[PDB]
Scaffold this active site. Structure first.
Site, PDB file in Angstrom:
ATOM      1  N   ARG A  20     -25.928 -10.654 -28.644  1.00 53.58           N
ATOM      2  CA  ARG A  20     -26.006 -12.070 -28.998  1.00 53.58           C
ATOM      3  C   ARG A  20     -25.136 -12.389 -30.209  1.00 53.58           C
ATOM      4  O   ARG A  20     -24.531 -13.465 -30.267  1.00 53.58           O
ATOM      5  CB  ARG A  20     -27.456 -12.498 -29.254  1.00 53.58           C
ATOM      6  CG  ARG A  20     -27.640 -14.009 -29.071  1.00 53.58           C
ATOM      7  CD  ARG A  20     -29.090 -14.490 -29.209  1.00 53.58           C
ATOM      8  NE  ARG A  20     -29.190 -15.834 -28.641  1.00 53.58           N
ATOM      9  CZ  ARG A  20     -30.219 -16.289 -27.931  1.00 53.58           C
ATOM     10  NH1 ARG A  20     -31.283 -15.519 -27.708  1.00 53.58           N
ATOM     11  NH2 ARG A  20     -30.169 -17.518 -27.440  1.00 53.58           N
TER      12      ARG A  20
ATOM     13  N   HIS B 177     -32.171 -19.548 -23.787  1.00 56.07           N
ATOM     14  CA  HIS B 177     -33.254 -19.882 -24.701  1.00 56.07           C
ATOM     15  C   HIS B 177     -33.113 -19.046 -25.973  1.00 56.07           C
ATOM     16  O   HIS B 177     -32.499 -17.981 -25.967  1.00 56.07           O
ATOM     17  CB  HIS B 177     -34.601 -19.613 -24.023  1.00 56.07           C
ATOM     18  CG  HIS B 177     -35.780 -20.101 -24.803  1.00 56.07           C
ATOM     19  ND1 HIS B 177     -36.471 -19.303 -25.690  1.00 56.07           N
ATOM     20  CD2 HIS B 177     -36.387 -21.310 -24.831  1.00 56.07           C
ATOM     21  CE1 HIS B 177     -37.459 -19.998 -26.225  1.00 56.07           C
ATOM     22  NE2 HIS B 177     -37.429 -21.221 -25.723  1.00 56.07           N
ATOM     23  N   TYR B 178     -33.706 -19.521 -27.080  1.00 51.91           N
ATOM     24  CA  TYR B 178     -33.497 -18.810 -28.341  1.00 51.91           C
ATOM     25  C   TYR B 178     -34.196 -17.459 -28.379  1.00 51.91           C
ATOM     26  O   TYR B 178     -33.871 -16.636 -29.243  1.00 51.91           O
ATOM     27  CB  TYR B 178     -33.938 -19.664 -29.544  1.00 51.91           C
ATOM     28  CG  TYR B 178     -35.425 -19.843 -29.756  1.00 51.91           C
ATOM     29  CD1 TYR B 178     -36.189 -18.884 -30.438  1.00 51.91           C
ATOM     30  CD2 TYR B 178     -36.064 -20.992 -29.317  1.00 51.91           C
ATOM     31  CE1 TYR B 178     -37.559 -19.073 -30.648  1.00 51.91           C
ATOM     32  CE2 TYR B 178     -37.418 -21.193 -29.530  1.00 51.91           C
ATOM     33  CZ  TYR B 178     -38.164 -20.234 -30.182  1.00 51.91           C
ATOM     34  OH  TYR B 178     -39.515 -20.474 -30.359  1.00 51.91           O
ATOM     35  N   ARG B 179     -35.130 -17.201 -27.470  1.00 54.90           N
ATOM     36  CA  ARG B 179     -35.849 -15.939 -27.547  1.00 54.90           C
ATOM     37  C   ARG B 179     -35.044 -14.786 -26.941  1.00 54.90           C
ATOM     38  O   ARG B 179     -33.986 -14.964 -26.319  1.00 54.90           O
ATOM     39  CB  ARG B 179     -37.217 -16.054 -26.877  1.00 54.90           C
ATOM     40  CG  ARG B 179     -38.196 -16.791 -27.766  1.00 54.90           C
ATOM     41  CD  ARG B 179     -39.570 -16.921 -27.159  1.00 54.90           C
ATOM     42  NE  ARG B 179     -40.467 -17.557 -28.122  1.00 54.90           N
ATOM     43  CZ  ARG B 179     -41.437 -18.405 -27.804  1.00 54.90           C
ATOM     44  NH1 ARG B 179     -41.657 -18.723 -26.528  1.00 54.90           N
ATOM     45  NH2 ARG B 179     -42.191 -18.944 -28.761  1.00 54.90           N
TER      46      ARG B 179
END
Ligand code: NA
Length: 181
Positions: A113, A128-130
């Site tokens: 990431r 998604h941020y997770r």
């Protein structure tokens, strides 16, 4: 087809090194599973062209690993830039998972990431941020019942598609071996 906001996006990158500010992405592969980890579709497997000045930042580990796998030859011959690789990957993902719904999935996926934030922010934004990090479960299992880990092994070829397939296989193994749901 099986388009669902519950589907998971798996991604693995190969890089010229461990530092996003210095190094570059040289390979990317994506896989979409359903929420139960069944593989629905494999995405583009892209060796991304880099000039010799960037390949020349590779240390011994990176040089020997990516030369022996054939990746360096594929990078030198590739006609695909980061932007084109983003375009191909987004065109694939949009057929299987809606934007912003899937966590980023893989092993120590925070590292990938970081490279996406720096070099492919348009693709980073699709997640998604997770994070679904299979190595979180690896590390907890090592502490709580380490003899479980001797029942699973990896090849570790640093061919991005084969390695992300091994990430999925690792989580499938944990589903049966350490989970009760
Ligand atoms: Na990886």
């Amino acid at each position: 087809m099986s388009f669902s906001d519950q589907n998971l996006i798996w991604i693995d990158l190969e890089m010229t090194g461990l530092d996003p500010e210095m190094h570059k992405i040289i390979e990317m592969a994506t896989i979409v599973t359903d929420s139960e980890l069944n593989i629905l579709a494999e995405g583009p497997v892209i060796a991304i062209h880099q000039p010799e000045s960037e390949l020349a930042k590779m240390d011994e580990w990176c040089t020997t690993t990516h030369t022996a796998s054939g990746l360096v030859a594929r990078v030198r011959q590739s006609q695909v830039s980061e932007e084109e690789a983003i375009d191909q990957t987004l065109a694939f993902l949009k057929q299987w998972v809606p934007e912003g719904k899937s966590p980023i999935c893989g092993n120590s996926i925070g590292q990938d990431r970081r490279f996406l934030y720096k070099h492919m922010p348009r693709l980073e934004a699709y997640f998604h941020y997770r994070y679904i990090d299979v190595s979180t479960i690896k590390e907890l299992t090592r502490r709580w019942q380490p003899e479980v880990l001797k029942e699973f092994s990896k090849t570790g070829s640093h061919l991005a598609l084969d390695d992300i397939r091994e990430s999925i296989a690792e989580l499938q193994f944990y589903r049966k071996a350490v989970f009760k749901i």
